[PDB]
Every structure is written in structure tokens, then in C-alpha cells.
Amino acid sequence: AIQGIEGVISQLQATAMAAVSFAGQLHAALDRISDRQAAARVQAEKFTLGEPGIALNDVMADMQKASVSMQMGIQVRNKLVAAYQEVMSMQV
Amino acid sequence: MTPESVMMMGTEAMKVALALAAPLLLVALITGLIISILQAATQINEMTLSFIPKIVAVFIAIIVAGPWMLNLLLDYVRTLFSNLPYIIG
Amino acid sequence: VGFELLDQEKFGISQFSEQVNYQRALEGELARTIETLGPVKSARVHLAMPKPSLFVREQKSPSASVTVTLEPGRALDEGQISAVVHLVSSAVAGLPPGNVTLVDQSGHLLTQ
Amino acid sequence: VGFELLDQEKFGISQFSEQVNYQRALEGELARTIETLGPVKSARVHLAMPKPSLFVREQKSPSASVTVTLEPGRALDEGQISAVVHLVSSAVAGLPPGNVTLVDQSGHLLT
Amino acid sequence: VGFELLDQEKFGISQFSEQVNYQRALEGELARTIETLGPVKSARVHLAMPKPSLFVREQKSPSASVTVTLEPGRALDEGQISAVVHLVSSAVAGLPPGNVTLVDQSGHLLTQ
Amino acid sequence: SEQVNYQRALEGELARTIETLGPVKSARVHLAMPKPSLFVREQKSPSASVTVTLEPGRALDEGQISAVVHLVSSAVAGLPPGNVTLVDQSGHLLT
Amino acid sequence: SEQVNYQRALEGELARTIETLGPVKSARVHLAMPKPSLFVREQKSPSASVTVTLEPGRALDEGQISAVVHLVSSAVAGLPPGNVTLVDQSGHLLT
Amino acid sequence: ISQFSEQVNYQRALEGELARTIETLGPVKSARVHLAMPKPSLFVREQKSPSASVTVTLEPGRALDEGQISAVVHLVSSAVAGLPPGNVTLVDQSGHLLT
Amino acid sequence: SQFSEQVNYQRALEGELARTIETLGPVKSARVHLAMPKPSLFVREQKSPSASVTVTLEPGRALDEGQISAVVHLVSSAVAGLPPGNVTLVDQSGHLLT
Amino acid sequence: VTSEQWLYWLHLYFWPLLRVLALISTAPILSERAIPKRVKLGLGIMITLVIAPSLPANDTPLFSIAALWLAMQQILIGIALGFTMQFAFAAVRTAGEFIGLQMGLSFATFVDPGSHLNMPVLARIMDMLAMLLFLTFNGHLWLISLLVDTFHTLPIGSNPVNSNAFMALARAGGLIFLNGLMLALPVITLLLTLNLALGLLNRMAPQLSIFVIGFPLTLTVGIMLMAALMPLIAPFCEHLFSEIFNLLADIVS
Amino acid sequence: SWSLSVQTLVFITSLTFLPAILLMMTSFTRIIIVFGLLRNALGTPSAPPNQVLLGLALFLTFFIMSPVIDKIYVDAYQPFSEQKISMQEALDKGAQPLRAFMLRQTREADLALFARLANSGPLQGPEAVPMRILLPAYVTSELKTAFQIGFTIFIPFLIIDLVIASVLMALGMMMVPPATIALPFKLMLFVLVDGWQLLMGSLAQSFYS
Structure with a gap:
């Protein structure tokens, strides 16, 4: 927006005068896990396609790693949900 | 929202309470005073005969002015509940 | 009647009474x-x-009946x-x- | 027929009364x-x-009827x-x- | 009367009475x-x-009608x-x- | 009432x-x-109308x-x- | 009322x-x-208007x-x- | 004497003694x-500093020293x-700012 | 009121000191x-109290540095x-002695 | 990679949460049972989410007596703040109950003290009026701000503590009475005169007075008197809130 | 975009926080507090078997949040379901109408306080306020509004008890409990003046005003 760019220049002036989070970390972890899974899937599809240079060893190992990463994400989600349920049971 | 509005609504509320309670209290007071002066004139003194006509008078007071009180209080509550969403802050 | 009717109001006046009195007064002034x-x-x-209700199937709008007595031979104009x-x-x-129904002293419907 | 006219009626006036009295006063001043x-x-x-009624999807609006008696032959102008x-x-x-409906002493609708 | 009517030292039956009095006083001073x-x-x-409505955030605005009586032949200016x-x-x-509607003693609309 | 009275007092002194x-x-x-509104949006700016009667021929200067x-x-x-609208006894807007 | 009265008393002493x-x-x-209002972009602030009547010809100095x-x-x-706005008896803005 | 009244009275008294x-x-x-x-308000950080205005009337020709x-x-x-x-603003009887 | 009591105490101390x-x-x-x-309704902060002392001297009786x-x-x-x-100390002519 | 050190986040988010929730459970209006528990817990959680990252994180383990000392400290601070705030409403309730008792509204307490028959309806009226005024003056926001601010004065980390300071809060128990009289001094006085007047009537022909003429008259007079006295509490309300707030600021440090 | 397994995991996890959304981001909170206060006022701490009040509050919230839900569905859920907007962008698109409702009702003082507590820079317009500031400001504003509504609700039910006690005391019946007499009269009042229609309409207007 024009007013949005005004706000950007205002924050730049703020930085001049002066002279990431848990949700961000969870989003980063989800993005990393999804990117790994998509990379393994894309390599598997490329191997199934018949394109040269892609070895079955690498495909199978990358699928293994993607499965392990998915399981790690599932466990983290399970605990996190359990901790949230525990906190919401706290008496106030 | 302003404290003037808060104190105005409180004052109007308690004046409504005063209007609701004034007929009954005044009737009871008048009956008690009349019975007391009659006792003084007749030189009769028992603390229980002043309690008898007071109940009858106050109960008649609801017969005569009861509908007026019931209509006043309902109107007050209706107006208060209708003006509730305009004195929000 | 009408506006004067609502003068000597005893404290004992039920909303119902209030309304009926308002209706009477309106009738009076309109006739006037x-x-x-x-x-x-x-x-x-x-x-x-x-x-009033709400079910569109059964809605009964307000209604009026007006009876006029005319001066000897003073027929009312369509515009009137x-x-x-x-x-x-x-x-x-x-x-x-x-x-709104308008009727004369002989029972002729002047409206429709 | 007067703002102060209804500005009394002792007390014990159900608000219904307060409104009706306002309506009468407004009518009086307008006629004046x-x-x-x-x-x-x-x-x-x-x-x-x-x-007001919470039965209709939106609020209805009010209406007015005005009857005027003119001075002998004093016809009202369109602008009037x-x-x-x-x-x-x-x-x-x-x-x-x-x-708003405007009518004369003979029953002619001027509106 | 305007603020004088408020200064009659008379009991304000209710907020509504107070509001009516305020409206009248403003009208009086403006006419003055x-x-x-x-x-x-x-x-x-x-x-x-x-x-205001009931559940409608749609809003409207107040209105005024001003009737003036002019001095014999004293027509008001456009600027006026x-x-x-x-x-x-x-x-x-x-x-x-x-x-705001402005009208003269003959019923001519001086505004739009 | 307290507010309305405050408004009429301010009007009086200003005219004075x-x-x-x-x-x-x-x-x-x-x-x-x-x-007034203490929310995060509702707000409106007040307004004033001033009528002056001048001494015979005493026109107000721009600075005035x-x-x-x-x-x-x-x-x-x-x-x-x-x-703020300022008007004279003849209906001329000095604004 | 207590506040409005404070205002009147102060105005009085300052004029004095x-x-x-x-x-x-x-x-x-x-x-x-x-x-005042916070995060309303440009809000505003308390304000004063001072009208002075001078002695015949007693013009106020810039320091004054x-x-x-x-x-x-x-x-x-x-x-x-x-x-703070300062004005004279003729309507000249001194500030 | 209201809590506000008590304060306003304190302010007036301080003003009086200082002038004295x-x-x-x-x-x-x-x-x-x-x-x-x-x-103090729940919408600001550093409360605004108090301020004072002092008007003095001098004896005929008794100009105040810089140290005064x-x-x-x-x-x-x-x-x-x-x-x-x-x-703190200091002003004379002629409207000269001494501070 | 406590506030009234505090004002009275401040005044009395001032009087005796001047005496x-x-x-x-x-x-x-x-x-x-x-x-x-x-005190403040929020935020910790001491404001070391302050004093202003005005003295009128006897004709020519200048105060010593020790004084x-x-x-x-x-x-x-x-x-x-x-x-x-x-603590600020000032004379009858407006000279700061401190 | 994929560290997500959990102990650091837990120690950063725990103790501020403990202090905020300790204030929440005792601070007026924020501690009223009508609020669902989950709403209070969520408000504390969100306030801690906003505040904690700026504070220096503590490293004391949750499995140590130092953690118990920290938790006791946070609970003490929160309950002290909330209770010192509650003292003003206690004073208003006292004044209202005394006006009502001089009304003769509950005469059964003079004959049967604490006999399951008492209705301080005026006390409730002025208590809820005081709550409305406190809501209007945004006292709760101030409370939250001061809860945040007491960190700079008193950090999460275990710090040594003082003594007569506690007395101060306990000595604040005097204010409830003192200021209470300051709210009841005019009206009760006139009521006193009224009772004195009734005494003059009883000095005439014996009996035939009091319990038959005094009660309705004094009830109506108290009603209209304090109905007229209602506009007076608001300056006294602000005075009470200012007293509690600056006492808290002076003594918490 | 995320893998389908990650999308399913995120959807299932986000389904957990529905009570939190209902309590801290919705009209439900100030649609309840009023009900609890009114129940405290009439002298019947059980009367409408809770569950009844909870169901009424849920239906009221559903009727009140209808335009916000409609805007979310038309702007976020519809493009997401038609594979036009990714899963990580539907959330951001749909969080904006809820944020705007959360503003239309959140007072200022709270916004200024929570803008100061976060040590954030100046917020010249409402478009610079993040969710981390609006959430607790909205919560506090809703709590204060609910308590104001309930405390003006409480007044007539205490007025009736006051007048009942005074009338009982006029006649010397000092040992008659006033609450037992006042409860039927409070019920009669709440029956007469459309106790629930007026309260329902007042709450609904209180949201749309």
C-alpha cells in the first residue's frame, strides 16, 4: 500500500534513531519436514520416470529418512498436544 | 460511559427505589403516629396495639397503589435493558 | 374526547387502558x-x-372505517x-x- | 395545542404517556x-x-397528514x-x- | 424560553424530560x-x-426546519x-x- | 444536565x-x-457557529x-x- | 463539577x-x-486562547x-x- | 475537604509561600x-515534568542580577x-522574560 | 486526613529549621x-528530597564559608x-551562597 | 539442528506465567468466579507470551528447592498486589453496610450476631457501583501494567526481602475503616440527628414512639439522603484507588 | 506447499484449539459472563440447568459471528478447497476478518497499554497492530464490557430487595428474611418485562453497535 510504504520508511527511521519465536520455530520445522518429504517423493517419481543418474539406493534411503522425519514430527505434535491439555487443566 | 452518566443512572435508580417504597413507608408511619397520639390522648400504653392497624394499612396500600408500582418498576427495567447497549464502554 | 379525554388520569391506569385511551383520542381528532x-x-x-406476528401467511394490517354525514346535497368529490x-x-x-373504508349517511361506499 | 400544555399532568405518568405528550406537542408547534x-x-x-417492531427484516418509517385552511382565495404556491x-x-x-400528505379545507390534495 | 425554561427550577421527570428540555432550549436560542x-x-x-435501529449498524443523521418572517420586503441574500x-x-x-430547510413567511423554500 | 450546563456556560463566556x-x-x-467513544475507531470533531453584531460600520479585519x-x-x-463559522448581523459569512 | 471548577479558578488566576x-x-x-488518544496517528493536545486589552497605545513587546x-x-x-494563541482587543494575533 | 480539594489547597499554599x-x-x-x-496516565511512559511561571514586580529600577x-x-x-x-519561567512587570 | 497530617508535618519542620x-x-x-x-501508581524511583533556604542577613553580616x-x-x-x-542557600539580594 | 531447546523455553515462560496467574486469581474483577477458568488461564498465557521474551531467562531447575522458593515469591507478589487492590472495595463495602445498618435494615444482628439472617443490600449496591467505577477508570489495565513493572523493581531471580513492608499491607487494614468513615461521616451524622430528634419525641408522653414511627421515617430519610449522596462517591472512589496504588508502588519496592 | 501428510497433521492439530478460539477470540465469552451474572442476580444459582445456558450462548454466538464466518469462507476456505490458495496462506487470509471483528469491539486504552508492554514502536494506524497486541486487548475489552453489562443488569434486582426490606421494616417485622420474599417478585419482574427477549436483543445490539 502507499500507506504501507509510508510505514516501512517510518520503521526505517525508527531503526536509524535506535542505532524467531516458538510459532516461527514450529513453522520452520514443519516446512523442513515437508520439504524433505517432497524431495524424496520427487526423486522417487524421477526414478520411476526412467531418467538417468537416479539410483534406487538413494531413492530408498531418502524415503527411509523422510519416514523417520515424519515420525519425529508426529511424536513432537503428540507431546505438544499433551502438554497443552495438561496446562489447560491447570486450576485458576 | 462517563462517571457523570454512572452516577446519574445510580441516582435515578435509587430515586426509583424511593418512589417504590415511599407510599408503604409513609402509610405505616402515619398509622403509627395516629395510633401513638390516640394512645397519648387516652393514656393507654401497650406496645402491641400499635402493631395491629399498621399491617392492615400497609396491606391495603398494595391494593390501592400496587399496580402503579408494578407499572413503574417494569418501565424502569425495560428502559434500562433497552438503553444498555448505548452506555457501553 | 380525544386529547381532552387523556387529562383526568387516575394513577390506576393499565397499559391496556393507556392504549385504548390513545386509540379513542386518535379516533376523535380524526373525526374532528x-x-x-x-x-x-x-x-x-x-x-x-x-x-402483528411475523408469519407472512397470516398478516392482518391495521384497518379503519369512516362514516361521514354530508350537508344537504353536499356530495364528496373523487379528490375529496x-x-x-x-x-x-x-x-x-x-x-x-x-x-380505509369511507361510507356516507345513506350507506353508500365512497371508497371501494 | 402547546408544548407547555402537556408539560404537567402531575406524575405517575407511564412513559407511554411521556411519548404521546411529546407527539402532541410536536403536532401543535408544527401546526403553529x-x-x-x-x-x-x-x-x-x-x-x-x-x-419499533423486531418482526420486520428492517424498520418501517412514520407518516404525516397536514390539513390547511387558507385565507379567502389564498391558493398555496407549488414552492409553498x-x-x-x-x-x-x-x-x-x-x-x-x-x-407527508397536504390537504386544503375543501379536501383537495396539494401533495 | 430556552435555557430559561431549564432555569424554572422544575423537577425533570426523567432523562427523556431532560432531553426534551435541551432540544427546546437549543431551538429557542437558534431562533433568537x-x-x-x-x-x-x-x-x-x-x-x-x-x-438508532435495533441490529442495523447503518446510521442516519438529524434534520432541521427553519421558518423566517422577513421585514416588509427584506429579501434574504444567497449569502444570507x-x-x-x-x-x-x-x-x-x-x-x-x-x-436544513429554510422557508419564508409565504412558503417559499429559500434553501434547496 | 451537568454537561449541558457546562456547554451553556462555555458558550456564554466565549460570547462575552x-x-x-x-x-x-x-x-x-x-x-x-x-x-465521545473509547473504542478504536468511532470519533467525530465538534463544531461552532459564531454570530457577531458589529458597531455601526465597524467591519472586522482579516486578522480579527x-x-x-x-x-x-x-x-x-x-x-x-x-x-468554526463566523457570521455578521447581515448574514455575511466572515469565514 | 470539581474539575470544571478547577478550570474556572485557574483561568481566573492566569488572567489576573x-x-x-x-x-x-x-x-x-x-x-x-x-x-488524548494513543496510536490515532496525529492526535492533538491541550490548548489556550488569551485575549488582552491594552492600555491606550501600550503595544506589547515581542518579549512580552x-x-x-x-x-x-x-x-x-x-x-x-x-x-497558546494571544490576541489583542482589535483582533490582531500577537502570537 | 475532598482528596482533590486537599491537593488543590496544597498547590495554592506552596504557590503562596514561594511568592512570599x-x-x-x-x-x-x-x-x-x-x-x-x-x-500520570496508563497511556504514556515518562510523566511530563511539572512547570512553573513566576512573575516579579521590581522596586523602581531594581533590575535583577543574572545570579538573582x-x-x-x-x-x-x-x-x-x-x-x-x-x-521555570521568570518574567518582570513589563513582560520581559528574565529566564 | 493523612495527607493533611503530612502537610502539617512538612510546615512544622520548615518553621523550626527557619527558626x-x-x-x-x-x-x-x-x-x-x-x-x-x-509516590507513583506505577514504576520504582526515588527522588532525593530538595530544600531551598533564603536568609536575610544583618546590615553587612556576610556569611562565612563555614557558615x-x-x-x-x-x-x-x-x-x-x-x-x-x-540544599540551595540564597541571600536577600538573590546571591546563591551554596 | 532440530534442537528446539525445551528447558530454556520452559524456564523463560514459566515464572512470569506463575506471577501473572497469581495476580489474576486474586485481582478484583479479574478474579471473579463468573469468568470461566480457561479464559483466565488463556489471558495469563497470552500476557506471558507477550512479556517473557524481553525478560532475562532464569536457569534454576524446576527440580530444586530454589524453584519452590521462586514459586512462593511469585505467589506472594501476585496475592499482595491483588489484595492491596481489593482493600478499596472492602472499604466501600464497609461504608455501605454501615449506612444500611443505621437504616435499621437488618435489626436482627443487634440481637442475634451472625444468626444466618443478614442482608447488606446497600453494601452490595455500592460494591457494584465501585466495581463499575473501577472498570470506568481502567484500574485493571493499571494492575496488569504494575504487575509487569514490579519485575524491574523485583526481578524473577530470588532476591532478599524486607519486613515492616508486610506490616504496611497489614496496616492498610486501617484504611478500610478510616476511609470507610470518611464515606459515611456526613449521612450517618444527619441520621444521628434524626435519631436524636426521635429521642426528643420520646421525652414526651411515654412509649407510643420508636418501633412504630421511627423506623419508616428513618428508612425513607436514609434512602433519599444517600440517594442524594450517590454523586459523592466518585471523587472518593478515585481517592481510594490513588491511595491503594501509590501505597502499592511505595511498599512493593 | 507442504506435503499432504504435513497438511493433514497440521489440520488435525489445529482442530484441537477450537475451545480456545471460542473462548478467547469469539463473542462467547461476553455472551456467557452476562448469563452467569444474571443467574447470580435472580437468586437461583442453578435454575436454567447450566447446559441450557451454554446451548443458548452457543446459538447466540453462531447467529452473531455469521458475517465473519461467511467472509472467512468466501475469502479463505473457498479458494483453499479449490486448490487455488495453499494451506499456509488460507490461515493468513482467514485470520484477517476475525482480526477486524476483534478490533471493532476492542477498546483503545487496552490497545495502548499492550502496545506499551511489548516495547513495540509507535502504531500510527490500526493497520500496524499485530495479533500479539490485539488478542489480549480484545480479551480485556470483552471482559470489561461483559462486567459493565452485568453490573447494570444487577441494579433492579437489588432495588427490589431494598424496597422489600424497607417495607418489611416499616411494620416492625424485623425477623422476616427479605430474600425469600424478594425472590418471587424478582421472578415476576423477569417474567413481565420480556426478561429474555430484551436481554437477547440488547446483547445482540451490544455486538452490532
Whole structure:
């Protein structure tokens, strides 16, 4: 927006005068896990396609790693949900 | 929202309470005073005969002015509940 | 009657009474003005102001019946009949003209 | 027929009464000003202010009927009919001009 | 009377009574200033303060009707009409000028 | 009532000072102060109408109109000058 | 009421001291003390209007204009001088 | 005496005594002190500094020394909890700013 | 009220201090003004109290450097937590003695 | 990679949560049972989410007596703040109950003290009026701000503590009475005169007075008197809130 | 975009926080507090078996939040379901109408306080306020509004008890409990003045105003 760019220049002036989070970390972890899974899937599809240079060893190992990463994400989600349920049971 | 509005609504509320309670209290007071002066004139003194006509008078007071009180209080509550969403802050 | 009727009000007045009295007063003033129109010697207005509800299947709009007595031979003009209709309809919140009946002293329907 | 006219009625007045009295007072003052207009000898204003209903998808609007008695032969100008309309409409919260009827002493609709 | 009516030291039956008194006083003072002006012999101001809906965030605005009686032949200037408009609009919280009607003693609309 | 009374007192004193100004014989001030809101959006700016009666032929100077504007605007919390209308006894907008 | 009265008393004392200034015959001070708004971009601030009547020909010095400004600004909690308007009996803006 | 009344009265008394001492100063014939004590609010960080305006009437021709202006500044600033000298204005009977 | 009590206490201390300062040879009259710090509805912060002392001297009775010192000491001690450096001493002509 | 050190986040988010929730459970209006528990817990959680990252994180383990000392410290601070705030409403309730008792509204307490028959309806009226005024003056926001601010004065980390300071809060128990009389001094006084007047009537012909004429008259007089006295509480309300707030600021440090 | 397994995991996890959304981001909170206060007022701490009040509050919230839900569905859920907007952008698109409702009702003072507590820079317009500031400001504003509504609700039910006690005391019946007499009269009042229609309409207007 024009007013949005005004706000950007205002924050730049703020930085001049002066002279990431848990949700961000969870989003980063989800993005990393999804990117790994998509990379393994894309390599598997490329191997199934018949394109040269892609070895079955690498495909199978990358699928293994993607499965392990998915399981790690599932466990983290399970605990996190359990901790949230525990906190919401706290008496106030 | 302003404290003037808060104190105005409180004052109007308690004046409504005063209007609701004034007929009954005044009737009871008048009956008690009349019975007391009659006792003084007749030189009769028992603390229980002043309690008898007071109940009858106050109960008649609801017969005569009861509908007026019931209509006043309902109107007050209706107006208060209708003006509730305009004195929000 | 009418506005004067609502003067000596005893404290004991049920909302029902309040309303009925308002209806009477409106009827009176309307009849009064209708007499003011030249050709009219006396007027009588009856209002039927009822409950509203919501079911569109059964809605009964307000209704009015107006009886006029004319001066000897003073027939009312079509425009006159129209003006009586307008006045009565306006004086009653949500009165659809088509629910105003105007009748003369002989029982002729002047409206429709 | 007077703002102060109903400005008494002792007390014990159910608000219904307070409203009806306002309506009467507004009617009176409007008729008064209308009479002031030169050609007008006497005016009579009737207001129908609907009491709000939560039955219709939207709120309905009020209506007015104005009867004028003119001075012998003092016919009202079109612009005059227009000014009467404006005044009456403005004096009533949310009065759509088109709901103001103006009539003469002979029953001719001027609106 | 205007503020004088408020200074009669009379019990305000209720907030509604207080509001009616305030509306009347404002009307009185406005008419007063309008008369004070040279060409104006007497003024009459009627204010309509509006009312809110029930569940409709859609809003409206107040309206005013001003009747002036002029001195024999003292026609009001266009600028005059403009100044009357400004004064009345300003005196009423949120009064959109376009909702001020100015009329003369003959029924001529001096505004739009 | 307390508010309305405050408004009428402010109007009175302002008219008073305005009449003090040499060329001014009498002043009339009308204030329109709107409903306040403590939310995060609802807000409206107040308005003033000032009628002056001048001494026979005592025309107000431009600077004079400016000073009247300043005084009235300052006397009303958050009154934007541009919402002050000044008019003479003949209906001329000095604004 | 307690606040409004505080305002009236202050206005009075300020006018008093201003008159007690050699060239000043009478003073009139109007204060607009309101409530501010945060994160409303450009809000506003308390404001003052000062009308002075001078002794026949007693023009106020630029320093005199400055000292009046200082006094009025200081007497009002958080009054930014730039929101003090000083005007003479003829409607000339001195500030 | 309301809590507000109690404060306003305290302010008036402080003003009076300060003017008194200022007058006792040789060159000063009469003094007038106005204090503006500010308000804490749940929408600001550093509360605004109090301010003072001092008007002095001098004896015929008794001009105040630079040090006289300074000492007046010091006294008024000290008498007001957290009064930053720079917020003390000193003016004469002719409208000359001495500070 | 407590506030009234506090104001009275402040006034009495001022009076006695001025009294002792006058009793001193060169001093004809003294005036003491105390500014006790204040509390806030939020935020911690001490405001070391402050004092202003105006003395009127006897014709030509200039105060010694030691005298300024002793006045400083007395006023500082009489006020709980008064840092000497916050005591201002001034004469009848407006000369800062401190 | 994929560290997500959990102990650091837990120690950063725990102790501020403990202090905020301790204030929440005791602070007036924020501690009223009408609020669902989950709403209070969520408000504390969100306030801690906003505040904690700026504070220096503590490293004391949750499995140590130092953690117990920290938790006790946070609970003490929160309950002290909330209770010192509650003292003002206690004073208003006292004044209202005394006006009502001089009304003769509950005469059964003079004959049967604490006999399950008491209705301080005036006390409730002025208590809820005081709550409305406190809501209007945004006292709760201030409370939250001061809860945040007490960190700079008193950090999460275990710090040594003082003594007479506790007395101060306990000595604040005097204010409830003192200021209470300051709210009841006018009206009760006139009521006293009224009772004195009734005494003059009883000095005439014996009996035939009091319990038959005194009660309705004094009830109506108290009603209209304190109905007229209602506009007076608001300046006293602000005075009470200012007293509690600056006492808290002075003594918490 | 995320893998389908990650999308399913995120959807299932986000389904957990529905009570939190209902309590801290919705009208439900100030649609309940009023009900609890009114129940405290009439002297019947059980009367409408809770569950009844909870169901009424749920239906009221569903009727009140209808335009916000409609805007979310038309702007976020519809493009997401038609594979036009990714899963990580539907959330951001749909969080904006809820944020705007959360503003239309959140007072200022709270916004200023929570803008100061976060040590954030100046917020010249409402478009610079993040969710971390609006959430607790909205919560506090809703709590204060609910308590104001309930405390003006409480007044007539205490007025009736006051007048009942005074009338009982006029006649010397000092040992009659006033609450037992006042409860039927409070029920009669709440029956007469459309106790629930007026309260329902007042709450609904209180949201749309």
C-alpha cells in the first residue's frame, strides 16, 4: 500500500534513531519436514520416470529418512498436544 | 460511559427505589403516629396495639397503589435493558 | 374526547387502558378534522389496531372505517374521497390506504 | 395545542404517556408554524410515529397528514407546497417526505 | 424560553424530560440569533434528533426546519441563506447542512 | 444536565470575550459537542457557529476574523478551526 | 463539577497575573483541557486562547508576547506553547 | 475537604509561600507564582515534568542580577517535587522574560 | 486526613529549621522550603528530597564559608535522606551562597 | 539442528506465567468466579507470551528447592498486589453496610450476631457501583501494567526481602475503616440527628414512639439522603484507588 | 506447499484449539459472563440447568459471528478447497476478518497499554497492530464490557430487595428474611418485562453497535 510504504520508511527511521519465536520455530520445522518429504517423493517419481543418474539406493534411503522425519514430527505434535491439555487443566 | 452518566443512572435508580417504597413507608408511619397520639390522648400504653392497624394499612396500600408500582418498576427495567447497549464502554 | 379525554388520569391506569385511551383520542381528532372539510357535517372514525406476528401467511394490517354525514346535497368529490383516505391512512402507523373504508349517511361506499 | 400544555399532568405518568405528550406537542408547534405562513389561516397536523417492531427484516418509517385552511382565495404556491413538505418531514425523525400528505379545507390534495 | 425554561427550577421527570428540555432550549436560542439578523423579524426552528435501529449498524443523521418572517420586503441574500444554514448545522451535533430547510413567511423554500 | 450546563456556560463566556473585542457590540456562540467513544475507531470533531453584531460600520479585519477563530477553536477540546463559522448581523459569512 | 471548577479558578488566576502586566488593562483566558488518544496517528493536545486589552497605545513587546506564552503554557499540565494563541482587543494575533 | 480539594489547597499554599520568599528578596516588591503539577496516565511512559511561571514586580529600577534570576530558578525548582529548572519561567512587570 | 497530617508535618519542620537558622548571629530572618518526593501508581524511583533556604542577613553580616557549610549540614540532617547537594542557600539580594 | 531447546523455553515462560496467574486469581474483577477458568488461564498465557521474551531467562531447575522458593515469591507478589487492590472495595463495602445498618435494615444482628439472617443490600449496591467505577477508570489495565513493572523493581531471580513492608499491607487494614468513615461521616451524622430528634419525641408522653414511627421515617430519610449522596462517591472512589496504588508502588519496592 | 501428510497433521492439530478460539477470540465469552451474572442476580444459582445456558450462548454466538464466518469462507476456505490458495496462506487470509471483528469491539486504552508492554514502536494506524497486541486487548475489552453489562443488569434486582426490606421494616417485622420474599417478585419482574427477549436483543445490539 502507499500507506504501507509510508510505514516501512517510518520503521526505517525508527531503526536509524535506535542505532524467531516458538510459532516461527514450529513453522520452520514443519516446512523442513515437508520439504524433505517432497524431495524424496520427487526423486522417487524421477526414478520411476526412467531418467538417468537416479539410483534406487538413494531413492530408498531418502524415503527411509523422510519416514523417520515424519515420525519425529508426529511424536513432537503428540507431546505438544499433551502438554497443552495438561496446562489447560491447570486450576485458576 | 462517563462517571457523570454512572452516577446519574445510580441516582435515578435509587430515586426509583424511593418512589417504590415511599407510599408503604409513609402509610405505616402515619398509622403509627395516629395510633401513638390516640394512645397519648387516652393514656393507654401497650406496645402491641400499635402493631395491629399498621399491617392492615400497609396491606391495603398494595391494593390501592400496587399496580402503579408494578407499572413503574417494569418501565424502569425495560428502559434500562433497552438503553444498555448505548452506555457501553 | 380525544386529547381532552387523556387529562383526568387516575394513577390506576393499565397499559391496556393507556392504549385504548390513545386509540379513542386518535379516533376523535380524526373525526374532528374530517368534519372541518366543508361538505362534512359530522364524521365517525373506527380504528382496528391489532397484533402483528411475523408469519407472512397470516398478516392482518391495521384497518379503519369512516362514516361521514354530508350537508344537504353536499356530495364528496373523487379528490375529496382521496384526501380523506390519505389523512386517515397517515394518522395510523402502517395503515395501508386500501384498508380505509369511507361510507356516507345513506350507506353508500365512497371508497371501494 | 402547546408544548407547555402537556408539560404537567402531575406524575405517575407511564412513559407511554411521556411519548404521546411529546407527539402532541410536536403536532401543535408544527401546526403553529404552518399557520404563520401568510396564505394559511389555520393548520392541523397528525403524526403517525410507528412504535419499533423486531418482526420486520428492517424498520418501517412514520407518516404525516397536514390539513390547511387558507385565507379567502389564498391558493398555496407549488414552492409553498414544497416548503410545507420539507418542514413537516424534517420535524419528524426519519420522516420520508413522500409520506407527508397536504390537504386544503375543501379536501383537495396539494401533495 | 430556552435555557430559561431549564432555569424554572422544575423537577425533570426523567432523562427523556431532560432531553426534551435541551432540544427546546437549543431551538429557542437558534431562533433568537436568526431573528437578531437585520432582515429577519421572527424565526421558528424545529429540530428532529434521529433514533438508532435495533441490529442495523447503518446510521442516519438529524434534520432541521427553519421558518423566517422577513421585514416588509427584506429579501434574504444567497449569502444570507448560506450563513443561516451554517449556524443551524453547527448548533446541532452532526447536522449535515443538506438536512436544513429554510422557508419564508409565504412558503417559499429559500434553501434547496 | 451537568454537561449541558457546562456547554451553556462555555458558550456564554466565549460570547462575552468576543463582545469585548472593540468592533463587536454583541456575540452569540453555539457549540455542537458530539458523543465521545473509547473504542478504536468511532470519533467525530465538534463544531461552532459564531454570530457577531458589529458597531455601526465597524467591519472586522482579516486578522480579527483569524483571532476570533483561534479563540473559539482553543476553548473547545479538539475543535478544528475549519469547523468554526463566523457570521455578521447581515448574514455575511466572515469565514 | 470539581474539575470544571478547577478550570474556572485557574483561568481566573492566569488572567489576573496577565492584567498585572504593565501594558495590560484586562485579560481573558480560555483553556481547552481534553482527553488524548494513543496510536490515532496525529492526535492533538491541550490548548489556550488569551485575549488582552491594552492600555491606550501600550503595544506589547515581542518579549512580552514570549513571557505571556511561557506563563500560560507552564500553568497548564503538558501545554505545548505552540497551542497558546494571544490576541489583542482589535483582533490582531500577537502570537 | 475532598482528596482533590486537599491537593488543590496544597498547590495554592506552596504557590503562596514561594511568592512570599521571592518578594522578601531585596529588588522584588511583589511576586506571583503559578504551578502546573501534571497527571500520570496508563497511556504514556515518562510523566511530563511539572512547570512553573513566576512573575516579579521590581522596586523602581531594581533590575535583577543574572545570579538573582538563577537563585529564583533554583528555589522554585527545588520547592516542586521533580521540577526541572528549565521548566521555570521568570518574567518582570513589563513582560520581559528574565529566564 | 493523612495527607493533611503530612502537610502539617512538612510546615512544622520548615518553621523550626527557619527558626534555628535565624537564631544564628549574622541571620536576621530565614525562610525554608522543603520538597519531599512523591509516590507513583506505577514504576520504582526515588527522588532525593530538595530544600531551598533564603536568609536575610544583618546590615553587612556576610556569611562565612563555614557558615554556608553548617547551614547545609543542619538542613540536610533535618530531612530524612536529604543529600546536601540538593540544599540551595540564597541571600536577600538573590546571591546563591551554596 | 532440530534442537528446539525445551528447558530454556520452559524456564523463560514459566515464572512470569506463575506471577501473572497469581495476580489474576486474586485481582478484583479479574478474579471473579463468573469468568470461566480457561479464559483466565488463556489471558495469563497470552500476557506471558507477550512479556517473557524481553525478560532475562532464569536457569534454576524446576527440580530444586530454589524453584519452590521462586514459586512462593511469585505467589506472594501476585496475592499482595491483588489484595492491596481489593482493600478499596472492602472499604466501600464497609461504608455501605454501615449506612444500611443505621437504616435499621437488618435489626436482627443487634440481637442475634451472625444468626444466618443478614442482608447488606446497600453494601452490595455500592460494591457494584465501585466495581463499575473501577472498570470506568481502567484500574485493571493499571494492575496488569504494575504487575509487569514490579519485575524491574523485583526481578524473577530470588532476591532478599524486607519486613515492616508486610506490616504496611497489614496496616492498610486501617484504611478500610478510616476511609470507610470518611464515606459515611456526613449521612450517618444527619441520621444521628434524626435519631436524636426521635429521642426528643420520646421525652414526651411515654412509649407510643420508636418501633412504630421511627423506623419508616428513618428508612425513607436514609434512602433519599444517600440517594442524594450517590454523586459523592466518585471523587472518593478515585481517592481510594490513588491511595491503594501509590501505597502499592511505595511498599512493593 | 507442504506435503499432504504435513497438511493433514497440521489440520488435525489445529482442530484441537477450537475451545480456545471460542473462548478467547469469539463473542462467547461476553455472551456467557452476562448469563452467569444474571443467574447470580435472580437468586437461583442453578435454575436454567447450566447446559441450557451454554446451548443458548452457543446459538447466540453462531447467529452473531455469521458475517465473519461467511467472509472467512468466501475469502479463505473457498479458494483453499479449490486448490487455488495453499494451506499456509488460507490461515493468513482467514485470520484477517476475525482480526477486524476483534478490533471493532476492542477498546483503545487496552490497545495502548499492550502496545506499551511489548516495547513495540509507535502504531500510527490500526493497520500496524499485530495479533500479539490485539488478542489480549480484545480479551480485556470483552471482559470489561461483559462486567459493565452485568453490573447494570444487577441494579433492579437489588432495588427490589431494598424496597422489600424497607417495607418489611416499616411494620416492625424485623425477623422476616427479605430474600425469600424478594425472590418471587424478582421472578415476576423477569417474567413481565420480556426478561429474555430484551436481554437477547440488547446483547445482540451490544455486538452490532
